[PDB]
Design a protein around this ligand. Structure first.
Ligand SMILES: *[C@@H]1O[C@H](CO)[C@@H](O[C@@H]2O[C@H](CO)[C@@H](O[C@@H]3O[C@H](CO[C@H]4O[C@H](CO)[C@@H](O)[C@H](O)[C@@H]4O[C@@H]4O[C@H](CO)[C@@H](O)[C@H](O)[C@H]4NC(C)=O)[C@@H](O)[C@H](O[C@H]4O[C@H](CO)[C@@H](O)[C@H](O)[C@@H]4O[C@@H]4O[C@H](CO)[C@@H](O)[C@H](O)[C@H]4NC(C)=O)[C@@H]3O)[C@H](O)[C@H]2NC(C)=O)[C@H](O)[C@H]1NC(C)=O
Ligand SMILES: *[C@@H]1O[C@H](CO)[C@@H](O[C@@H]2O[C@H](CO)[C@@H](O[C@@H]3O[C@H](CO[C@H]4O[C@H](CO)[C@@H](O)[C@H](O)[C@@H]4O)[C@@H](O)[C@H](O[C@H]4O[C@H](CO)[C@@H](O)[C@H](O)[C@@H]4O[C@@H]4O[C@H](CO)[C@@H](O)[C@H](O)[C@H]4NC(C)=O)[C@@H]3O)[C@H](O)[C@H]2NC(C)=O)[C@H](O)[C@H]1NC(C)=O
Ligand code: NAG
Ligand code: FUC
Lengths: 207, 207
């Protein structure tokens, strides 16, 4: 039968007031025999009616997928309200319900440092700039590199790793042409996290 | 019914001649009523008799698990020999077989760099030393920090990340007391990977 998964908003969306956070309910293995899936939504058990719901054909295995995207208030997520989807269909013996909310826990802002290329690497054509983001809680975070404030393309992040002390850390690696590194620049590491002032910080090199 | 999962040796075990690589066959959801699983082992279809097999209770959901651990020859894994477990039980309609072997692919040795603390961190009570390990294939790798040849305690690794070009990279973060960094030390990063001479390299500072 159909099964149901619930997904949180993207951390960047829920921390940036200008963005549009969404909680998503996905119903997989929907059948064309009973395709009229109903998804109802509740915020602390108060029903809301604004979700955008669409059916998609998954040709990988000839199934249907119903995706319901509920737009949410930033503060409702951040204050810990519960978001619940209730899934009804003619082929379900009983409704399926899923709930998600922001976990409780300590907040610790990340320490953000940018590290120059290793000296041994300076004889190469391309060099590596390292953004180190550490000592942060919870693990939800958004990290990017920018050049002149304009988001880069050739950067790669690690996933956050749990430390022994309970905080997390990650790195963002940026490969640049050595010419651009030696010449004066504004390569910067941008970090979006709950613990930061205005949920955002940037870090640049001194020279 | 019972299901069967097979697992390769740990990369450190199979690359280091002093260690003991194992291929493991796990039979999950064995029943109290028919618990007598017979597990036979084959290396390139030649039967071998050295595996150690044990039954365990899983208290999370009150089930049984049979774990069969085959000690293997390092070179047999590295040269691509196939390792096969055949699982018999009376509640099985037919035997279940699993095979595993070293995946094919290109080998590229890691570039290994050690990075000093960010200058803005040097006045704090603790500093971070970074081992940056890049440009390696396959992703299977082992990294540690040592001081005076002894393995450190307060280091944590990221999991390898796939780069655009098909290579992988990771970081190992060693946090030390700033006093110990400033005074003479021998902090070093050791990397175990198939592409390295004797599968091992080390990188130190102040050189
Ligand atoms: C036909 O083909 C279909 C297409 O492949 C296939 O659909 C797939 O079905 C599987 C289930 O069989 C389902 O798997 C789940 O995936 C969850 C993660 O989904 C993410 O990421 C994957 C890729 O990693 C994507 O494919 C998904 O689309 C989804 O992407 C996210 O989408 C949201 C909203 O669109 C975005 O906002 C995100 O940004 C985006 N992320 C990314 C990275 O892209 C995963 O969470 C599920 O795991 C949980 O359930 C399992 C049980 O099924 C457990 O084993 C597992 O441990 C997890 O358990 C949960 O654990 C929590 C904490 O540990 C608990 O709190 C929960 O209660 C617990 N849940 C349960 C149920 O126990 C799961 O692996 C795929 O998502 C789905 N793909 C799509 C595209 O729909 C069909 O199955 C095929 N059918 C047949 C008959 O063959
Ligand atoms: C009771 O509770 C126990 C304990 O939780 C539970 O046992 C687990 O059962 C699940 C299956 O239901 C097992 O899942 C597999 O895990 C594999 C990894 O296992 C390691 O890591 C986990 C933690 O991450 C440890 O718990 C574990 O001890 C090992 O260290 C994973 O590899 C498996 O995934 C493969 O198989 C599934 C199909 O089942 C498939 O969906 C995956 O995509 C993947 O498929 C394989 O893909 C490769 C390509 O990459 C392909 O080559 C290969 O052919 C595919 N193989 C198959 C079979 O498809 C899977 O997720 C888990 O290991 C069990 N844990 C333990 C500790 O035993 C019981 O199931 C519970 N029982 C009940 C009744 O509740
Ligand atoms: C990530 C993880 O859990 N890996 C382990 C693996 O090391 C072990 O060999 C296997 C056999 O039990 O079980 C699993
Ligand atoms: C200890 C148990 O082992 C396995 C998992 O599938 C369970 O969720 C739990 O982690």
């Amino acid at each position: 039968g159909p099964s149901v998964f619930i997904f949180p908003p993207k951390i960047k969306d829920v921390l940036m007031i200008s963005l549009s956070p969404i909680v998503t309910c996905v119903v997989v293995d929907v059948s064309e025999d009973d395709p009229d899936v109903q998804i109802s939504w509740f915020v602390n058990n108060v029903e809301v009616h604004t979700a955008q719901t669409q059916t998609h054909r998954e040709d990988y295995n000839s199934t249907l997928r119903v995706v319901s995207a509920l737009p949410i208030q930033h503060q409702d997520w951040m204050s810990g309200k519960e978001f619940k989807c209730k899934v009804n269909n003619k082929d379900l013996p009983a409704p399926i319900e899923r709930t998600i909310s922001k976990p409780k826990g300590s907040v610790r802002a990340p320490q953000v440092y940018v590290l120059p290329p290793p000296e041994e690497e300076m004889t190469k054509k391309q060099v590596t700039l390292t953004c180190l983001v550490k000592d942060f809680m919870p693990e939800d975070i958004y990290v990017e590199w920018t050049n002149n404030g304009k988001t880069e393309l050739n950067y790669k992040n690690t996933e956050p790793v749990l430390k022994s002390d309970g905080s997390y850390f990650m790195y963002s690696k940026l490969r640049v042409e050595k010419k651009n590194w030696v010449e004066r620049n504004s390569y910067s590491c941008s970090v979006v996290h709950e613990g930061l002032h205005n949920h955002h910080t940037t870090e640049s090199f001194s020279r």
